[PDB]
């Protein structure tokens, strides 16, 4: 029952992300024992290319005595951008690799910025290639540059753990450098808080459908995304129409009525005082006062290439697509960064979006952009505005 933490490496090309990844797994395996390996033989049958975002990712797993880590690394900057905006696993923490020999480089900055935008909660720094530097004053200068860069994007640069190491020497089994990998793993253990379990968060249910029941009453269905709903508790119905308040009078599962519904379950929720016409797909049920409806937000967006089955042509400032949040589409207009007139297939940009009606949302919520139900883009709410 070792807590599960998702992490990944970020930083500029050639700074050592792949070597560090291999070094962490090797050292931790030889020190604490390797992670449990599951069945995962790969099908030799040829696989035709399918529509959708293509993301090159490597995954490994490694354990410390108290934690289990799932670790993602990518070959190139384009892959990091996609994975951070819309990659299969949201990082609980990132390891920023910076080569002491270069100091912070353009993709060092870009990855930290992206990190702030998509909500990476924590960043730990591995100052790599220290085997090439005999010059403590230079190491201190590079660390100061890194801390100042982090703080520029509101990461706590002064409080950030920074490990001085060599991924390559550690991978090659040099004991002195292996110790720096253990130090890094120590900071993954102590600096990244155990992530909050879904069942422990305030109740939230994305409404998939609405039915009449008991003659005049109403039941809404969906999957409990987080928390617990119990009969007798009040809920707010948030988004699209004016926020309403109701009381849960039953949780419907199959052909019975239960006293509660928990995160992960598919349930119907009976609501007091709610007419069928007053509630619709795409609204959410939520613990009162824990999520608000917004129409305007800042986001970071990746636009699919033609090869990924997205748009064939660029769009301009007047573009008006469908934004898909949880369970429904909502039309909205966009503002591009100044200086930017059009957006090409394959681009990523900051986009200011104004929806035609409000949607329940917080910072960090992911969404798709679609044309006729076909995905042409993927985004994340960076900052809610109104």
């Amino acid at each position: 029952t070792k807590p599960h933490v998702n992490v990944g490496t970020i930083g500029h090309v050639d700074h050592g992300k792949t070597t560090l990844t291999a070094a962490i797994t090797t050292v931790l395996a030889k020190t604490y024992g390797g992670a449990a390996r599951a069945f995962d033989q790969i099908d030799n049958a040829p696989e035709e290319k399918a529509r959708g975002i293509t993301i090159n990712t490597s995954h490994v797993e490694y354990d410390t005595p108290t934690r289990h880590y799932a670790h993602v690394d990518c070959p190139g900057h384009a892959d990091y951008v996609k994975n951070m905006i819309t990659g299969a696993a949201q990082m609980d923490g990132a390891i920023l690799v910076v080569a002491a020999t270069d100091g912070p480089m353009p993709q060092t900055r870009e990855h930290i910025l992206l990190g702030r935008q998509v909500g990476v909660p924590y960043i730990i720094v591995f100052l790599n290639k220290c085997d090439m530097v005999d010059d403590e004053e230079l190491l201190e200068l590079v660390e100061m540059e890194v801390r100042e860069l982090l703080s520029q994007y509101d990461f706590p640069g002064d409080d950030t753990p920074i490990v001085r190491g060599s991924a390559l020497k550690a991978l090659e089994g040099d004991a002195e450098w292996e110790a720096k990998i253990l130090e890094l793993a120590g900071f993954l253990d102590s600096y990244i808080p155990e992530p909050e379990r879904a069942i422990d968060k305030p109740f939230l249910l994305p409404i998939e459908d609405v039915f009449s029941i008991s003659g005049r009453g109403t039941v809404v269905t969906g999957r409990v995304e987080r928390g617990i709903i119990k009969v007798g508790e009040e809920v707010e119905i948030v988004g699209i129409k004016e926020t309403q308040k109701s009381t849960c009078t039953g949780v419907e599962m199959f052909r019975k009525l239960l006293d509660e519904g928990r995160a992960g379950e598919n349930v119907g929720v009976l609501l007091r005082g709610i007419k069928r016409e007053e509630i619709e797909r795409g609204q959410v049920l939520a613990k009162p006062g824990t999520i608000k409806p917004h129409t305007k937000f800042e986001s970071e967006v990746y636009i699919l290439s033609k090869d990924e089955g997205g748009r064939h042509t660029p769009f301009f400032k007047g573009y008006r697509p469908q934004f898909y949040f949880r369970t429904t589409d909502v039309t909205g207009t966009i503002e591009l960064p100044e200086g930017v007139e059009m957006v090409m297939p394959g681009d990523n940009i900051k986009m200011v979006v104004t929806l035609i009606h409000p949607i329940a949302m917080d910072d960090g919520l992911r969404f798709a952009i679609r044309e006729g139900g076909r995905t042409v883009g993927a985004g994340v709410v960076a900052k809610v505005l109104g």
């Binding site: 069945f39 995962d40 099908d43 030799n44 049958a45 598919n266 949880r326």
Partner: protein, 181 residues
């Protein structure tokens, strides 16, 4: 032995292959079938050395509601681009372990282990595209007059049954036979 009507059968109403220019090899199977599972390592070692002029495709059986669920799961994994990662462990999970992955909900749960969100699994499972695949699967099976699984159909005109290396031996004979006109 490689004799027509004994080691393989000639399809009465032969079909035209999906992709012109390649020799089609098409496997009909169900994840729930132990005989399919016994065939699989033989198919796997045969796949390692696919000739450049043959195309191999799996067409999961879907003639009934039970097998259709496996069939939808498969086409879904292909739709999402993860079949190469999921196919053998899914097969292993069901056949070696005792996992009950025989419906939409438990398949979705299984696929979270491979990054796939349940909402995306669910929209795909019942999408028109997957449903079209299911229909095509059933169309071929009725035309080729398959009564069950496993079955490997070559260039839409020969059926090979069995669950061991004899299958891939007869396939190679048929593949080479096609190569002449």
């Amino acid at each position: 032995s490689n004799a027509a009507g004994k080691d393989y059968t000639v399809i009465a109403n032969p079909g035209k292959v999906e992709v012109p220019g390649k020799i089609e090899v098409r496997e009909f199977f169900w994840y729930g079938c132990p005989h399919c599972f016994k065939l699989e390592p033989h198919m796997q070692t045969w796949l390692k050395q696919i000739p450049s002029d043959v195309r191999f495709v799996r067409t999961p059986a879907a003639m009934n509601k039970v097998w259709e669920q496996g069939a939808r799961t498969y086409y879904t994994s292909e739709a999402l681009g993860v079949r190469k990662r999921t196919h053998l462990p899914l097969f292993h999970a069901i056949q070696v372990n005792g996992q009950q992955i025989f419906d939409q909900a438990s398949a979705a749960k299984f696929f979270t282990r491979y990054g796939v969100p349940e909402q995306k699994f669910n929209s795909t499972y019942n999408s028109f595209a997957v449903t079209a695949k299911v229909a095509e699967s059933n169309k071929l099976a009725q035309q080729y007059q398959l009564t069950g699984v496993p079955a490997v159909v070559v260039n839409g005109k020969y059926v090979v049954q069995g669950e061991d290396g004899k299958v891939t031996q007869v396939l190679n004979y048929l593949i080479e036979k096609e190569r002449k006109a």
